[PDB]
mmCIF file of C-alpha atoms and ligand atoms in Angstrom:
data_model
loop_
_atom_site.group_PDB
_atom_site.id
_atom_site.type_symbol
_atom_site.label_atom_id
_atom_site.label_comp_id
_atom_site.label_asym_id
_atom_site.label_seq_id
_atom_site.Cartn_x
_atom_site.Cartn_y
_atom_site.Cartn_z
ATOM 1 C CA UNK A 2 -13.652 -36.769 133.559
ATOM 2 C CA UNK A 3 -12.327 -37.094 137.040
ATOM 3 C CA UNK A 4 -10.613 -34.177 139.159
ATOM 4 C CA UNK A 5 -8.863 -34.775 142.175
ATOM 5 C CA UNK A 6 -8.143 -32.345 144.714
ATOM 6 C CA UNK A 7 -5.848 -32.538 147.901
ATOM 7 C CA UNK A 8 -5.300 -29.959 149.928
ATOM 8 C CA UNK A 9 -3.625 -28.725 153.465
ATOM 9 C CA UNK A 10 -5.189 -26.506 155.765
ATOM 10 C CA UNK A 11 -4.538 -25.360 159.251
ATOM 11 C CA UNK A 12 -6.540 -21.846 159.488
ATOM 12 C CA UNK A 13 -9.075 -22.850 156.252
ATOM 13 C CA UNK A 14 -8.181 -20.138 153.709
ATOM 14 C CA UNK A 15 -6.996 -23.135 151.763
ATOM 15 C CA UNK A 16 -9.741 -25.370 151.767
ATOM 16 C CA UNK A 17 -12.126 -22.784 150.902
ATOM 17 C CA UNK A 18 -9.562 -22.119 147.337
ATOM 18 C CA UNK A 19 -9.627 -26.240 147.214
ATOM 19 C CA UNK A 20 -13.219 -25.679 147.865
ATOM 20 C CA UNK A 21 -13.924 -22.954 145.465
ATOM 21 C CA UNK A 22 -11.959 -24.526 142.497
ATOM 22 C CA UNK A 23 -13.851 -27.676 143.241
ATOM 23 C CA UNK A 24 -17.655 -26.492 143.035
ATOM 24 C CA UNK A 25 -16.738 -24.707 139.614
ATOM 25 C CA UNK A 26 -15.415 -27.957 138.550
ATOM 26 C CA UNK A 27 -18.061 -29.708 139.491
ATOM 27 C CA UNK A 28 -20.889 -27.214 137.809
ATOM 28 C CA UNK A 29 -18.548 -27.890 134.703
ATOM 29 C CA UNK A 30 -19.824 -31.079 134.322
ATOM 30 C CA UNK A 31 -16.466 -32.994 136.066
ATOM 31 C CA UNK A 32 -16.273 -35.841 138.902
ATOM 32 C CA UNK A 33 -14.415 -34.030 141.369
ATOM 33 C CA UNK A 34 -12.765 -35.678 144.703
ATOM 34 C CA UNK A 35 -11.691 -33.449 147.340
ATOM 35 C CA UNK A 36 -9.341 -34.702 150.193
ATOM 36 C CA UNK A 37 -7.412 -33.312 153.044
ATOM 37 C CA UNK A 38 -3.561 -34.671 152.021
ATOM 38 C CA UNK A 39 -3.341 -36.862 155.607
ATOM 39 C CA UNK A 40 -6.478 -39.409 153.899
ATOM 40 C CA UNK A 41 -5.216 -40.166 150.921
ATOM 41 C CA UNK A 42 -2.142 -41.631 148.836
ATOM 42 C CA UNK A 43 -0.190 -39.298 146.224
ATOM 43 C CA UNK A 44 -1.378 -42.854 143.925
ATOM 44 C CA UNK A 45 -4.612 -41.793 143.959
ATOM 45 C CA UNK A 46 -3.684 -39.685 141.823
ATOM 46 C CA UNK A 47 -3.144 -42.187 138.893
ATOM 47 C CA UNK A 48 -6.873 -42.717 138.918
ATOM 48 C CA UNK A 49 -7.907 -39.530 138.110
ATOM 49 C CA UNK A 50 -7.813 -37.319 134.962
ATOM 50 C CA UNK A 51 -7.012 -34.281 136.680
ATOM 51 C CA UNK A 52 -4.283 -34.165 139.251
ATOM 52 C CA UNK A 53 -4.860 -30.395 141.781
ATOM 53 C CA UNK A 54 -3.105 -29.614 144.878
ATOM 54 C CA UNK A 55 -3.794 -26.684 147.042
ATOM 55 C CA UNK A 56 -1.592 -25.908 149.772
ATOM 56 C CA UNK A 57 -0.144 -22.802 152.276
ATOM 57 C CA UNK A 58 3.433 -22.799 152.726
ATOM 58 C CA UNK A 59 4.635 -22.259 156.330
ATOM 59 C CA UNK A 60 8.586 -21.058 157.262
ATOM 60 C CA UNK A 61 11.508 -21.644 155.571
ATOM 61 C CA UNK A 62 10.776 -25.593 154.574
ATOM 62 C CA UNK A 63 7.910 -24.234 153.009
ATOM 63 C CA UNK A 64 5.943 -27.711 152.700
ATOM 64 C CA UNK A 65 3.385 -27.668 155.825
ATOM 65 C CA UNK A 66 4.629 -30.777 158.518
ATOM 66 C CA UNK A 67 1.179 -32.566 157.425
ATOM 67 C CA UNK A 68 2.120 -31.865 153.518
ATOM 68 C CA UNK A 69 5.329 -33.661 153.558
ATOM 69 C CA UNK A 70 4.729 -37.309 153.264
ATOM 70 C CA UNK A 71 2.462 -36.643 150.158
ATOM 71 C CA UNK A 72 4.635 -34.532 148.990
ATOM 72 C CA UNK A 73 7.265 -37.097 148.912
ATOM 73 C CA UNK A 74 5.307 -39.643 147.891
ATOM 74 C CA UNK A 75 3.882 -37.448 144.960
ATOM 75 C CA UNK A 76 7.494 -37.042 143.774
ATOM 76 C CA UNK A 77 7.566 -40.927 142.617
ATOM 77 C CA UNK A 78 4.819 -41.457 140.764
ATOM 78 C CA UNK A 79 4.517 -41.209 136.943
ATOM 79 C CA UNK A 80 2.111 -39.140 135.678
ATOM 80 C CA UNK A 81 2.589 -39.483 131.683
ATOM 81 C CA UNK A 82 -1.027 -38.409 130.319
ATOM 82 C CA UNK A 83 -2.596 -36.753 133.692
ATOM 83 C CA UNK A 84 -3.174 -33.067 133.582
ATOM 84 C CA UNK A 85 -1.836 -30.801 136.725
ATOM 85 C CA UNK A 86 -2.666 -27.328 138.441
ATOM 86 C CA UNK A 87 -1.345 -25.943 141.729
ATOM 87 C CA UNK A 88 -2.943 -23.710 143.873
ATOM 88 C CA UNK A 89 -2.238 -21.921 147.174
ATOM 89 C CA UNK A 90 -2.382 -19.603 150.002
ATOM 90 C CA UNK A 91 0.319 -17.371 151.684
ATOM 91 C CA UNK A 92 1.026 -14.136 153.006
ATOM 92 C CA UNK A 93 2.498 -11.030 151.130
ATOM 93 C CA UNK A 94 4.582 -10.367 154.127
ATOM 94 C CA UNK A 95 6.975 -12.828 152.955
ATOM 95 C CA UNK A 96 9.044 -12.760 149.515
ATOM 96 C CA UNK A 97 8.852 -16.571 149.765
ATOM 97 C CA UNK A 98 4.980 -15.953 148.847
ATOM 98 C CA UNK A 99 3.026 -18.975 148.239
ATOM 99 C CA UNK A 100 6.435 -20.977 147.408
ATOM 100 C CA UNK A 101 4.741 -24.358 148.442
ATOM 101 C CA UNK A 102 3.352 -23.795 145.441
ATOM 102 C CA UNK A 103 6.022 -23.291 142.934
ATOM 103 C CA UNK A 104 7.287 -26.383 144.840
ATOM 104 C CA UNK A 105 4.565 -28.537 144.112
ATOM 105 C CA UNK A 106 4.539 -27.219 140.586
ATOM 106 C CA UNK A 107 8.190 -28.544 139.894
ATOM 107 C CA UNK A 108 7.438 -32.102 141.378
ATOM 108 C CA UNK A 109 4.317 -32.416 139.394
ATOM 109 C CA UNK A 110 6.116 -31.281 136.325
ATOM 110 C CA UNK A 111 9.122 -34.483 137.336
ATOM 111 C CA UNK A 112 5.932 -36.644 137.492
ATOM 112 C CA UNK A 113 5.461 -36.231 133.721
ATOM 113 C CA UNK A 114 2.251 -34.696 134.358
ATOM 114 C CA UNK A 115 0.988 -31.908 131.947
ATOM 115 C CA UNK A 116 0.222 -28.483 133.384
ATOM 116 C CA UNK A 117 -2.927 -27.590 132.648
ATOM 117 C CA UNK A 118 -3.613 -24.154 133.776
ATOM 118 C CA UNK A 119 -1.127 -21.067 135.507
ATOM 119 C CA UNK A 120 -0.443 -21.673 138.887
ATOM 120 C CA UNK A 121 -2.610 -19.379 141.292
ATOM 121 C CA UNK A 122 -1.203 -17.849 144.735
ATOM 122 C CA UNK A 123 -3.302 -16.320 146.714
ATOM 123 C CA UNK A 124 -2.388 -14.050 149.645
ATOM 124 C CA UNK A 125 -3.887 -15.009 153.109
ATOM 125 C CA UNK A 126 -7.583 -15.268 152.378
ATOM 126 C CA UNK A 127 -9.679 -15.111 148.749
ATOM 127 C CA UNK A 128 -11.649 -11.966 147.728
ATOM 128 C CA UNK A 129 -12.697 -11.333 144.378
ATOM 129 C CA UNK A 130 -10.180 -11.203 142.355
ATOM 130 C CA UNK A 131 -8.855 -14.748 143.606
ATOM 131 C CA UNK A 132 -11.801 -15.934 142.791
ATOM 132 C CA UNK A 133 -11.593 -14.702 138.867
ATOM 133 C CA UNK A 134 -8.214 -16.397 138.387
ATOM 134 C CA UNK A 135 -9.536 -19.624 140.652
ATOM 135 C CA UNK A 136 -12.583 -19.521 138.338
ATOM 136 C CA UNK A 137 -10.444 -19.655 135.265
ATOM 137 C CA UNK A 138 -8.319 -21.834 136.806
ATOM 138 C CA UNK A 139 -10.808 -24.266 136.847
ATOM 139 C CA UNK A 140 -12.276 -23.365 133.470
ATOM 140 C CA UNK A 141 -8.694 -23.883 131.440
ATOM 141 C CA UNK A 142 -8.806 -27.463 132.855
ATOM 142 C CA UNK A 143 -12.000 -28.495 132.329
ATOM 143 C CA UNK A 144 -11.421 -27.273 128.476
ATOM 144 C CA UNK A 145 -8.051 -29.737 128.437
ATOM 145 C CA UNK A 146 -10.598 -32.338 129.282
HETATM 146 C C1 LIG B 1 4.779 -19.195 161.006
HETATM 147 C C2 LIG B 1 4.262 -18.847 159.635
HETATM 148 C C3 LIG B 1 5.131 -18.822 158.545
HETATM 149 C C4 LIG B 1 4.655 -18.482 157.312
HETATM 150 N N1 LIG B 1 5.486 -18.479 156.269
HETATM 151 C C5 LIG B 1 5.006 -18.156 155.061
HETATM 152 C C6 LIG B 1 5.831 -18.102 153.870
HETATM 153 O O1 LIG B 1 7.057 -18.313 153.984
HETATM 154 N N2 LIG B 1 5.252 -17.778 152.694
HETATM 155 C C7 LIG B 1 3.966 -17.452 152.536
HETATM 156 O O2 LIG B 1 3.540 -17.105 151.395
HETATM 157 N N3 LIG B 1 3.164 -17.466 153.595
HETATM 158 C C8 LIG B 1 3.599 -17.808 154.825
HETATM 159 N N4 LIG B 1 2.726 -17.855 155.903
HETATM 160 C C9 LIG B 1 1.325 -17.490 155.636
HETATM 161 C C10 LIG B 1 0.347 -18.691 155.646
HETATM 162 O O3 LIG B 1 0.686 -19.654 154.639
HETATM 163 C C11 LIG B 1 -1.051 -18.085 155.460
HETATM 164 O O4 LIG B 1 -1.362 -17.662 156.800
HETATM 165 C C12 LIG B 1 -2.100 -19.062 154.928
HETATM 166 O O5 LIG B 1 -3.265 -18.301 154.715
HETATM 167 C C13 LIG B 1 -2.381 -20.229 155.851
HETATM 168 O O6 LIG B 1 -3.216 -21.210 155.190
HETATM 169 P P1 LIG B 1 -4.395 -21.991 155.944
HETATM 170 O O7 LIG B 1 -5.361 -20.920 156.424
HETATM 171 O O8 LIG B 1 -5.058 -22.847 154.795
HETATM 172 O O9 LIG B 1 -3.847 -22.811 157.097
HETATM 173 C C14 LIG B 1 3.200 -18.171 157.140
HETATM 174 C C15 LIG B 1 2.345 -18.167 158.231
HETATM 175 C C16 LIG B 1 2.825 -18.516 159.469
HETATM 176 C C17 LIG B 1 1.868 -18.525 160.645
HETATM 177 CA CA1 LIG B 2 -12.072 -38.880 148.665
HETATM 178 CA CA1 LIG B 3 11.179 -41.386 146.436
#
């Protein structure tokens, strides 16, 4: 089974999450693919078994600037069959917390795409107990297979 992960960063406390989820996968016995969302087409996607996006939301729009064409692009593809999970970084300082996520969450689910595991938010950088619910993150969607 293949994984694919894209993720946007600016500061890194979201590629380490993409990161993180993606050397668990990987020690699960999974092909995983991780990508920085400016290299690669939304499409990709339709070649994997395992469709993850990390992101960090930024203002009011929520989507990061570099996010948005993927984003978009995500939001036509059909998914039908393909497993989903959504991961992120914000800041508690905001009530908005981590709402990229519950954004990409909604388009995935529009997709046809099956989610596959809770969405995990994760405030500013990961310490422990991020790491639990990554970790089981990752574990729910290896066991969906
Ligand atoms: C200008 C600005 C606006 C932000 N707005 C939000 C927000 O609305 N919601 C949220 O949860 N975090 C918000 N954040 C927090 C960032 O998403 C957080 O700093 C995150 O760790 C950045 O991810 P990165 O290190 O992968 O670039 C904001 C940060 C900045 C600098
Ligand atoms: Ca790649
Ligand atoms: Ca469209």
């Amino acid at each position: 089974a293949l994984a694919k992960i894209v993720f946007a960063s600016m500061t890194g406390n979201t590629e380490e999450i993409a990161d993180i989820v993606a050397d668990k996968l990987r020690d699960l016995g999974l092909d995983v693919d991780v990508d920085e969302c400016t290299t690669v087409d939304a499409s990709d996607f339709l070649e994997a078994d395992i469709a993850i996006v990390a992101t960090y939301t930024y203002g009011d729009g929520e989507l990061p600037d570099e996010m948005m064409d993927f984003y978009e692009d995500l939001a036509d593809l059909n998914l039908n069959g393909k497993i989903y999970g959504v991961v992120g970084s914000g800041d508690t300082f905001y009530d908005e917390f981590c709402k990229a996520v519950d954004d990409f969450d909604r388009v995935f689910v529009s997709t046809g795409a099956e989610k596959g595991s809770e969405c995990v938010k994760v405030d500013l950088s990961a310490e422990e107990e991020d790491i639990e619910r990554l970790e089981q993150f990752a574990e729910e969607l290896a066991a969906k297979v």
